[PDB]
Amino acid sequence: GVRTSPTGEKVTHTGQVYDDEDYRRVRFVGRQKEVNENFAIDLIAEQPVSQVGSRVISCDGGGGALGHPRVYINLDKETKTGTCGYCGLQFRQQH
Amino acid sequence: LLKKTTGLVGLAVCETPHERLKILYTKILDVLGHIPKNAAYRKYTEQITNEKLSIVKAEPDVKKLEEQLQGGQIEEVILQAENELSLARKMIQWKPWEPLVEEPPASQWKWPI
Amino acid sequence: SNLIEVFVDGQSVMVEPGTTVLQACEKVGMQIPRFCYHERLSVAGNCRMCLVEIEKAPKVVAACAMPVMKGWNILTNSEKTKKAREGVMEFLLANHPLDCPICDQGGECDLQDQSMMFGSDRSRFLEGKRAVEDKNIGPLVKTIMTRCIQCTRCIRFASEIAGVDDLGTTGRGNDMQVGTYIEKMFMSELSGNIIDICPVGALTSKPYAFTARPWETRKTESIDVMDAVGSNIVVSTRTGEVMRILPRMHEDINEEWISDKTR
Amino acid sequence: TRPTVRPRNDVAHKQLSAFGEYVAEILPKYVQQVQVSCFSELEICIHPDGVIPVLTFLRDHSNAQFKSLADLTAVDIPTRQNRFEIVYNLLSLRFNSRIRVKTYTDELTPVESSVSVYKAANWYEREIWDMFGVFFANHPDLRRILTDYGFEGHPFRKDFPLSGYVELRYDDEVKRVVAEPVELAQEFRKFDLNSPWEAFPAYRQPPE
Amino acid sequence: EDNKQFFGRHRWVIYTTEMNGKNTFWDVDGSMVPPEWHRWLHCMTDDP
Amino acid sequence: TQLITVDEKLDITTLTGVPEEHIKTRKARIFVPARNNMQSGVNNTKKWKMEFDTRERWENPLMGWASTADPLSNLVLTFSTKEDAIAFAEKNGWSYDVEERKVPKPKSKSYGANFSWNKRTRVSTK
Amino acid sequence: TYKYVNLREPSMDMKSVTDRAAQTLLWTELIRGLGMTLSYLFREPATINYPFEKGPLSPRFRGEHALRRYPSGEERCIACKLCEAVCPAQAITIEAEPRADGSRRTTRYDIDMTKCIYCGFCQEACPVDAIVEGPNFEFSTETHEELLYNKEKLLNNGDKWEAEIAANIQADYLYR
Amino acid sequence: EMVRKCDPHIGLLHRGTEKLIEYKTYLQALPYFDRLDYVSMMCNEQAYSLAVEKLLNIQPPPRAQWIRVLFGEITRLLNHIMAVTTHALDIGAMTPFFWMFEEREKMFEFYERVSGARMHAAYVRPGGVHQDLPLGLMDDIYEFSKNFSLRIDELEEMLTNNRIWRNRTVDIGVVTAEDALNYGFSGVMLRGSGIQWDLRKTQPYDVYDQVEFDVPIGSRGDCYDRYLCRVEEMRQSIRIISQCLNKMPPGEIKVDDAKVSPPKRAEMKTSMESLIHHFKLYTEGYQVPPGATYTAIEAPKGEFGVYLVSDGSSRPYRCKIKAPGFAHLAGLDKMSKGHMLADVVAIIGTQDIVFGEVDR
Amino acid sequence: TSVKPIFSRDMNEAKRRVRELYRAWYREVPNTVHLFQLDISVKQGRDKVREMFKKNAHVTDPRVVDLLVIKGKMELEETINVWKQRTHVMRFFHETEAPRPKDFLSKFYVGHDP
Amino acid sequence: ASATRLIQGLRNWASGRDLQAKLQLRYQEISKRTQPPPKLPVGPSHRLSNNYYCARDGRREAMPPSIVMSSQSEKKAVSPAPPIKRWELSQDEPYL
Numbered sequence A: 001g002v003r004t005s006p007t008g009e010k011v012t013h014t015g016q017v018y019d020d021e022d023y024r025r026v027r028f029v030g031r032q033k034e035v036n037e038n039f040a041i042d043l044i045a046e047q048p049v050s051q052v053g054s055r056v057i058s059c060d061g062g063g064g065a066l067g068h069p070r071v072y073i074n075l076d077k078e079t080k081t082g083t084c085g086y087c088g089l090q091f092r093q094q095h
Numbered sequence B: 001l002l003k004k005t006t007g008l009v010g011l012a013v014c015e016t017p018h019e020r021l022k023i024l025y026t027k028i029l030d031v032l033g034h035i036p037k038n039a040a041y042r043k044y045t046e047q048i049t050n051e052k053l054s055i056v057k058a059e060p061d062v063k064k065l066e067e068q069l070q071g072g073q074i075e076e077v078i079l080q081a082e083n084e085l086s087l088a089r090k091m092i093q094w095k096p097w098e099p100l101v102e103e104p105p106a107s108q109w110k111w112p113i
Numbered sequence C: 001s002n003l004i005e006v007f008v009d010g011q012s013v014m015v016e017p018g019t020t021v022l023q024a025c026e027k028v029g030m031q032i033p034r035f036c037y038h039e040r041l042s043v044a045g046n047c048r049m050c051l052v053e054i055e056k057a058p059k060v061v062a063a064c065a066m067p068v069m070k071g072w073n074i075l076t077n078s079e080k081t082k083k084a085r086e087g088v089m090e091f092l093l094a095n096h097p098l099d100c101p102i103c104d105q106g107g108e109c110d111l112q113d114q115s116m117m118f119g120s121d122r123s124r125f126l127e128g129k130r131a132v133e134d135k136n137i138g139p140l141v142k143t144i145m146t147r148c149i150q151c152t153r154c155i156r157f158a159s160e161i162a163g164v165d166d167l168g169t170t171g172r173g174n175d176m177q178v179g180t181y182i183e184k185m186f187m188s189e190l191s192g193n194i195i196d197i198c199p200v201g202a203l204t205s206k207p208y209a210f211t212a213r214p215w216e217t218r219k220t221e222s223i224d225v226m227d228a229v230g231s232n233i234v235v236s237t238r239t240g241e242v243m244r245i246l247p248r249m250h251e252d253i254n255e256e257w258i259s260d261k262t263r
Numbered sequence D: 001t002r003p004t005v006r007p008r009n010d011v012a013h014k015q016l017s018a019f020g021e022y023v024a025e026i027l028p029k030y031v032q033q034v035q036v037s038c039f040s041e042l043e044i045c046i047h048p049d050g051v052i053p054v055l056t057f058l059r060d061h062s063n064a065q066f067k068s069l070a071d072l073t074a075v076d077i078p079t080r081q082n083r084f085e086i087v088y089n090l091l092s093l094r095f096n097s098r099i100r101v102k103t104y105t106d107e108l109t110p111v112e113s114s115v116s117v118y119k120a121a122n123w124y125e126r127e128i129w130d131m132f133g134v135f136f137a138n139h140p141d142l143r144r145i146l147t148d149y150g151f152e153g154h155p156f157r158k159d160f161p162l163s164g165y166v167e168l169r170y171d172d173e174v175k176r177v178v179a180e181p182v183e184l185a186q187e188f189r190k191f192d193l194n195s196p197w198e199a200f201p202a203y204r205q206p207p208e
Numbered sequence E: 001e002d003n004k005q006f007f008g009r010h011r012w013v014i015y016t017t018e019m020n021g022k023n024t025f026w027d028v029d030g031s032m033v034p035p036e037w038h039r040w041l042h043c044m045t046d047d048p
Numbered sequence F: 001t002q003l004i005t006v007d008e009k010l011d012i013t014t015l016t017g018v019p020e021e022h023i024k025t026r027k028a029r030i031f032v033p034a035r036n037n038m039q040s041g042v043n044n045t046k047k048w049k050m051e052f053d054t055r056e057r058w059e060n061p062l063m064g065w066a067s068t069a070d071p072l073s074n075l076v077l078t079f080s081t082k083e084d085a086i087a088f089a090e091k092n093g094w095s096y097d098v099e100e101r102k103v104p105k106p107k108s109k110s111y112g113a114n115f116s117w118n119k120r121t122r123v124s125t126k
Numbered sequence G: 001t002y003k004y005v006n007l008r009e010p011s012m013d014m015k016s017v018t019d020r021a022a023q024t025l026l027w028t029e030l031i032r033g034l035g036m037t038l039s040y041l042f043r044e045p046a047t048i049n050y051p052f053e054k055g056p057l058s059p060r061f062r063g064e065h066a067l068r069r070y071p072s073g074e075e076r077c078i079a080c081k082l083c084e085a086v087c088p089a090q091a092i093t094i095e096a097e098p099r100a101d102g103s104r105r106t107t108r109y110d111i112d113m114t115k116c117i118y119c120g121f122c123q124e125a126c127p128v129d130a131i132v133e134g135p136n137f138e139f140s141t142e143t144h145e146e147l148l149y150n151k152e153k154l155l156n157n158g159d160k161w162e163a164e165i166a167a168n169i170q171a172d173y174l175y176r
Numbered sequence H: 001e002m003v004r005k006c007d008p009h010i011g012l013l014h015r016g017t018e019k020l021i022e023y024k025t026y027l028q029a030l031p032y033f034d035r036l037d038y039v040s041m042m043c044n045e046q047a048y049s050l051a052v053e054k055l056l057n058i059q060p061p062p063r064a065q066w067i068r069v070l071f072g073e074i075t076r077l078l079n080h081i082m083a084v085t086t087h088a089l090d091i092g093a094m095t096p097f098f099w100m101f102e103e104r105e106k107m108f109e110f111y112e113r114v115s116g117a118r119m120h121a122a123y124v125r126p127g128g129v130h131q132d133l134p135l136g137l138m139d140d141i142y143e144f145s146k147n148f149s150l151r152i153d154e155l156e157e158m159l160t161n162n163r164i165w166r167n168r169t170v171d172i173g174v175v176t177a178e179d180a181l182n183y184g185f186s187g188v189m190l191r192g193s194g195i196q197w198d199l200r201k202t203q204p205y206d207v208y209d210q211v212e213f214d215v216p217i218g219s220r221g222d223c224y225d226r227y228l229c230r231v232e233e234m235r236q237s238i239r240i241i242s243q244c245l246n247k248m249p250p251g252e253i254k255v256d257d258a259k260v261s262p263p264k265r266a267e268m269k270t271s272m273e274s275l276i277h278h279f280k281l282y283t284e285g286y287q288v289p290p291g292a293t294y295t296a297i298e299a300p301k302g303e304f305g306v307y308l309v310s311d312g313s314s315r316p317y318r319c320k321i322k323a324p325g326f327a328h329l330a331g332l333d334k335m336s337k338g339h340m341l342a343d344v345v346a347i348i349g350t351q352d353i354v355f356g357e358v359d360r
Numbered sequence I: 001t002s003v004k005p006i007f008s009r010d011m012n013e014a015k016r017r018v019r020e021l022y023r024a025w026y027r028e029v030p031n032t033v034h035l036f037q038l039d040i041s042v043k044q045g046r047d048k049v050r051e052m053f054k055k056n057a058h059v060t061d062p063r064v065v066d067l068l069v070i071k072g073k074m075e076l077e078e079t080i081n082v083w084k085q086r087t088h089v090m091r092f093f094h095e096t097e098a099p100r101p102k103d104f105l106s107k108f109y110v111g112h113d114p
Numbered sequence J: 001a002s003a004t005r006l007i008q009g010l011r012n013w014a015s016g017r018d019l020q021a022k023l024q025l026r027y028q029e030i031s032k033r034t035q036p037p038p039k040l041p042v043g044p045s046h047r048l049s050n051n052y053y054c055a056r057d058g059r060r061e062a063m064p065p066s067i068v069m070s071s072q073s074e075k076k077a078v079s080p081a082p083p084i085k086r087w088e089l090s091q092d093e094p095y096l
C-alpha cells in the first residue's frame, strides 16, 4: 500500500519521505525515487490465519532448511493469534 | 675422485679438504683456548670441534667424511668451520659468559598483558 | 582473625567463616558460571550451573550456596565440574527457543556467552520444545516467557528490593511459569531493573526493543540527573544517537540499580 | 582428544627446551628468558645491548647455523615502559629449525642494526622505523619505506588512529594533490566484541 | 544451443531489437537477459 | 661511559606526528570500564582503558550515516595498571582524568537466612 | 626427491658440434618457434562472443546483493545485524524498529557496493537467508552514489532476481 | 649502460593491511590475505589458516587438508603461469601469455565453482575450508590436468631452447647461495642457487608428507635456472594434483569443534547450541588462546609467513606478514650490479614480485 | 634516569646538530623553489623552515631533539633528491585548508569543538 | 575439434605434437552443469553419546609457554634438532 505525499513524493514502507522545505529532494529532480511497491506489512496481513489442532505449533517458514530457525508458538490465548517472530505467519488453535 | 662442482653457486670445490679441515679445527681450538675455562662457549665448542677433528683424522675418504660429519658437502663444512672461527674471535671481544648486564623490567615479558 | 584456610585449585586463600564456595573462587580471581546467583539477591540455588567439585568428595556442590569448610580444595576446572557445567547447560538449552536473531539479549546474553564458554557445541535433544504464553506486566518490560530459564531473579528482586511480592512461579515441573498469574501490571519505581538481572531475553526493554544491538554501542559512563541521587549510568549510543541507559555499579549510591525514570 | 585437537609434539618440545638451555648458558650476559610454547616454538628473550652478539652466535655457531633471517617484526605494547618488542625470526636450514629472538625498546632508545649479521634486515628494521619509530643505530640507509613522503607519525603504533590525520584529494584551484584533515562520510564503527566470561583458565592472571 | 561448439560457445542469445521501449537493434546489452534465462545462458544449469 | 643523564620530563609529542589540535584540546579518560549489567561476567572489568572525549558526529547528507571529523574517536588503549595508563598519557601530552577502580564489596551470603525464625530476611517464596 | 634442471654437459663429438653449429647458422630452434606459432594460427580460438555469449558461472557465484522474501511476500530480514557484524569491510549499515504490527524489521539497510569486498560472509552469516549475493555482475554505473544501495534497491534486486536466486540456493543449500 | 645502483621505492600499494587486521576478527581478517599475493590467494589463506589453527590447538579434517593441498597446487600453477608469462612479456615474448591465460581462466573457473569468486575465494579457513567440493568438480580438475602438460610443453617449446630467451636470462641475476641465504631469499630464489630447501619437504604441512614430488634444483643461480625451476615446479604441481585427485578421502570439510568452525545451516536452524554458536562465531568470533606463532609455508613465491599474536580476545593483537618478495626486492640492488637496464627488468621478472605482498 | 644516547651526549652537541640542520635547509630552499617550480618566494620557504624549527624550540631532552634532527635530515634527503614531488613540498603550506576560527566567539559560532 | 583433417595434419605437423589428443578447448567430456543433490557426511563429533566437549576441547588444552630459563657437568652440546637428512636424487627423473 504505497501512498503519495503532498509534494508528489512516494512514501516508502518504512515511512520515509522528504519534507517540502527539505533541499535533499533536489537529488530526485530530473531522476526518480526508487521505492519498492511490495510492502511486506501488507503481504503478510493477506495470509490466512492457520487453524491447527495442537496447543503448541512449530514454524520454520516452510522449505525446511531454506526458511528460518524452527520456533514453537503457544496458542493458549484465544484473544490473540500466535504469530511467528521470524516470518509473521500466524496460527490459531482451532478449538 | 675430484667432485666436479659443489652444486652451490659461489662455493668452490676444495681440492684438499682434510688438511684444510685440520688447519681450521686446530685454529678454532687455538683461538678457543683464549676463552676462560668456566665459559660454556669454550666447553661446548671444544667438545664439538674435537669431535669433528677426531672424525676428520679417522676417515681418509671425502664421501664417507661427508656422510659422517653430517653437514652436507665438505666445502660447506669448511665454510662452517670458518664461520665458527670468526664467531669465536668475536666472542673473545664480546665476553658473553659474564653475568646479565641488566634485569628486564618487572612485566617486560608478561603476555597476555 | 577467625579466617579459615581453603584451597581453590590448590591455591591457598583465607576466607571469613560462612563464605560460599563461589566467593572463595572469586577471591582468587575466578568467576564460576551462574544463572540464578546474583550478589545482591538472596541465594536460590535452582539453576545448578555453579556445581563445582570439592576433591575427595563424590558429589558436586552448589557453589552459590554451599559454605566452605576448612581445607576444601575447590576444583574449578576438573573433569566432573566441566561435565556438570555441560550437562546443566544442555538442560538449559533443551527447551530454549531458537530466537537469538530476534532476541534483544543477543550479544549480551549470559546463556549465549557461557554456552560458548562452559557447554557443549551441539544438541542431543531430538524432541519438540515447549512454548510459553507471553505475559503483560507493563508498557516497559517486554515479556517473552519461552526464553525464561526459571532462575527466579524476577521474584527475588520484586520481593526483596522492590518490595512488590507480585511475581511468582505458577505450576509445577516443566510447566512452571514465571508470571503474576493474573492480568497484573508490574509497575514499581524500580521495575526496569528486572531487565538488567534477567540473564536471558525473557524480560527485555520495550523502548529499546529491536532498535540496537550491544556490540555496536558506545558506552559513555555518565551521571543521572532525574533525581538528586546522582546514580551512575551508562549512556549507550550508536552512530551518534542515544540508544539506552544502563546502570553503572557504585557501591555507595545506586548499587547497581536505577529508577524507571532514569532508565 | 584424537580427531579435532592438534597432536602435541613432545620430541621437538624437549629438543627445543634443551637447545634453549644451551643458548641461555652460552650467552648469559644477554639472555633474560627462554620459553617454549605448546606448539613447540622457541623464544629467546634477550637484552637490547646484545642483539648483535646473540644473532651472530645463532648465525655462525656450529650447533645453531640460523643462516636465514625469515622475518623481523616490532610489536607495540603501550602498557610496557619499553613499549616496542622487536622480534627476530630465524631459520636454520642445517638443523631444519626456527628460533625467535625477542628484545625491547621504547620510543627513544636506539637498537643496534643487524645488517652486519643479516643483510635481509636492511629493509625490515627500516620498515620498523617507518611503522613504529624505533630508530636503528648504524643502519646504512635508514629512511621511510612504506608511508608517503611527507607522512608524519608512525602508523603501526596503537596510539595512532586507524584512519590517519590527513586525507588526500585533487584540488583544482591549486592544480595539485593536497592534504586536508581527515573527515569520513561514515565513521569507522568500533565494535565491542569481547565476552565478559573468561575463555581460557590456563592463561588466568593472578589478581591484585 | 549448439552442443558441438566448445564450452562457452555452446549457448547464446540473440537480443531483441526492442526491449522496454528502447531500440536495441545496435545497442544490445548484457543485462537484457531476464533472470530465468540468466542461469541457462551463464551455464549455472543444464535446464532452460 | 655509554650512558648519559637526562633529568627532563619524558615527552614525545614532537615525534608522534599528532597535530596540535588533538593534543591540547583532548581529554583522555583513564578508567576500568564498568560491567555491562546485562551480563554477570567480569572479564571486561580487568584492565584499565584510556579513551578520549567524544567529538561531533553528524548526519551524512547523502546516506544518513554518522560522519565524523575526529581521528581519535575510536582510539581505546588498554593498560595493565593505572600508572602505566597515566605514564602513557603524560608521555604523549594528553590531559587526562582518572576514575579509580570500583570494586564490588564482599557480601554476606547465607542460604539458611532465607528461612529465619525471627528476622525479616525470610523469603516469601522460593 | 630433487632433480637438477640445467645440469647437462653437451656432447663434444663432431656430430653434436655440427648439430649445434647448424642450429646456430641455420636457425633450427627459431623455425621450431615459428612452427609452434603457426600451429596456433590454425586452431579455433577461445574467444566467446560477449555479450551474446556469456562466461560460465556456478550457482555459488558472488555478484550483486539482494534481500529475499518468504513465499508469502514478507521479507526474510529480521534486523539481527549479524551480516553487519561479520562484514569485513563494514559495508552494511542497519537501523531497525518495531513496525506497526510489532514485527522486528529494518528501517535502514544500506550496503555500500564500493566498500563491499564481495566475499559473501553476510549471506552465510544470515540465519534466515535474507541477504544474499546474487548472480548479477553486470551492474556498472556512471555515478559513484548509484552503487550506494539502500533497502529499497536491495529489496528491488530481490524482487528482480528472485526467480534465479531461489534456484541457485536450491542447487547449493545442501553444501551449506 | 651499466647499473651502478638500483634503489626501489615502494609503498605505492601500501594500504596498512596489518593495522586493519588488528581491528577485525580472525574470520574478518582472512580476506586480507587473498589480497596480499593476489596471484596466490588460497596459498596465503592456507598460511594464515595454519597460523590460526596452530594458535587454536585444533586441526582440520583430512579431506580439508587434501583440498587445501589440491587447491594450493592449482594456485601454484596459477602463480607460476603469471610469473613465467609476465616475465616473458616484459622481455618481449608476448604470445605464451595469451596461450597460458586460457588455462588460467579454467583454473579461475575452478575457484569460482569451489567458492563463488574467481580470485579472492576466502575459501581456506581456520578449521578446514568453508564449503565442500561441488559434485563433478574433481572430474573437471582431472580433465584440466590431463591436458596441461602439453601446454607446459609448448610454452617450453617457445622459450627454453630459444637463443633470444637464453641470451636475456643466462648470464643475468646470478646469486651465490651464501648471499641468497644471507639476504633472506626463499623459494626458487634459493633453489636456483643450488640450495636444497623446500618447506613442503623439510617442514611439511597439511598432507605434503603424503604426496610424492620432486624439487627442481638450479645450478647457476641465474634467471634461466629460476625459469626452469618454475617450469619444473609446474610439472611437479601437476604430479601432486594427480595424486590428490587419486587420494581424496571422504568426510567433513570443517573441524567438528563448533566453537571454531560454524555449524551447518540445516542444524543452525534446528539446534539451540548450533544457533548460539553460529551467532557468536559470526558476531564475536572465536577467542584464540594468547600466544604468538610464526607459521610459514612454501607459497609459490617463497616462504610466506605470518607472525600472529593473540592476546586472548577474538581479534588479533598483531599480525606481521612475511612476504618473500619483500626480501627479494631488497636483494634487487645486489642482483643488478654490473648488468644493464634491460637486464634489471629481467631480474624484476625472475624475482616474482607482486607489490601487494611487498607493500601490505 | 641514566639512558643510552642516540647521537648527543648532552644538549650542546644536540644544538650543534640542530644548527647544522638549519644551515643545510637554509642552503637548500632556493634549489627547492627552483627545481620543484614552486610558486612561493624563497623568503616564504625560509620562513616556513624557520617556523618548522621554532615549533620544536621547547624540547629539553637530548634524545628527542636527536630524533628531530634525524627526521629533519630524512625530510631534507627526500627534498634534495627528487623523491618528494611538488605536492609533498607544498603540504607544509596549508593552502586549501580554510583558516580555522582562533578566538572563542567564532569557535562558539561554528560548532562544538574548543 | 571441428577442423578439417588437412588443417588438423598441418597443425599437428607445425606443432610437432598430436594436438587432437589433448585439446585445450572443452566439449561434452566435462561435468554436467546440473548435478544430483549431495548427502554430505558428518564429522566424528556427531555422536549422541560419549561426546562430552571437555574431552575434545582443543583451545582449552593450549598451555602457556613453558619457561625454560628465566632471570626470575660435562654435558653434551645440543642442536635444535638432529641435522637434516641429505636429500636423495630423484629416481623418477634426475636429469643426469
Ligand code: SF4
Residues within 6 Å of the ligand: C096, C097, C098, C099, C100, C101, C103, C104, C105, C106, C107, C109, C110, C111, C112, C147, C199, C200, C201, C202, H276
Ligand atoms: S535469551 Fe540468549 S540464548 Fe535465548 S534466544 Fe535470546 S540471545 Fe539466544
Ligand code: SF4
Residues within 6 Å of the ligand: C147, C148, C149, C150, C151, C152, C153, C154, C155, C178, C197, C198, C199, C200, C202, C203
Ligand atoms: S524471566 Fe528472567 S529473571 Fe525471571 S525467572 Fe525467568 S530467566 Fe529468571
Ligand code: SF4
Residues within 6 Å of the ligand: G083, G086, G087, G088, G089, G090, G091, G092, G111, G115, G116, G117, G118, G119, G120, G121, G122, G123, G133
Ligand atoms: S559480501 Fe562481504 S564485504 Fe560485501 S556486504 Fe557481504 S559481508 Fe560485507
Ligand code: SF4
Residues within 6 Å of the ligand: C101, G076, G077, G078, G079, G080, G081, G082, G083, G084, G094, G122, G125, G126, G127, G128, G129, G130, G131
Ligand atoms: S540480512 Fe540476515 S543477517 Fe542481516 S540483519 Fe537481516 S536477518 Fe540479520
Ligand code: FES
Residues within 6 Å of the ligand: C033, C034, C035, C036, C037, C044, C045, C046, C047, C048, C049, C050, C051, C062, C063, C064, C065
Ligand atoms: S548459581 Fe548456584 S545454582 Fe544457580
Ligand SMILES: [K+]
Residues within 6 Å of the ligand: C105, C194, C195, C196, C197, C198, C199, C200, C201, C202, C203, C204
Ligand atoms: K534481560
Ligand SMILES: [Zn+2]
Residues within 6 Å of the ligand: A059, A060, A061, A068, A084, A085, A086, A087, A088, A089
Ligand atoms: Zn515462521
